[PDB]
Amino acid sequence: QKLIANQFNSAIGKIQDSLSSTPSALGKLQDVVNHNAQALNTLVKQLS
């Protein structure tokens, strides 16, 4: 039990670092934001 509780806690502690250091870890969610803004810019820019 004591060893298993240690392994779990170390695994949790690396998640805080993994997402912070890697830039494209949340690429899927950033794609939702980018596609929406790009569509609206195209709609606005197409007025000229």
Binding site: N41, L47, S48
Partner: protein, 48 residues
């Protein structure tokens, strides 16, 4: 100023609210523009 009116500057008919602008203009530049190629900054012909 600060009221929805019809403006007509040398034939730029339009509708909107005219406020004081701190946009630096080069002495050659007469009117500004935005992304959609619409006038969003004007120079009064009489009072500079």
């Amino acid at each position: 100023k600060n009221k929805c009116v019809n403006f007509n500057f040398n034939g730029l008919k339009g509708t909107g609210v005219l406020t004081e602008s701190n946009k630096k203009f080069l002495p050659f530049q007469q009117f500004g523009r935005d992304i959609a190629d619409t006038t969003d900054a004007v120079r009064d012909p009489q009072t500079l």
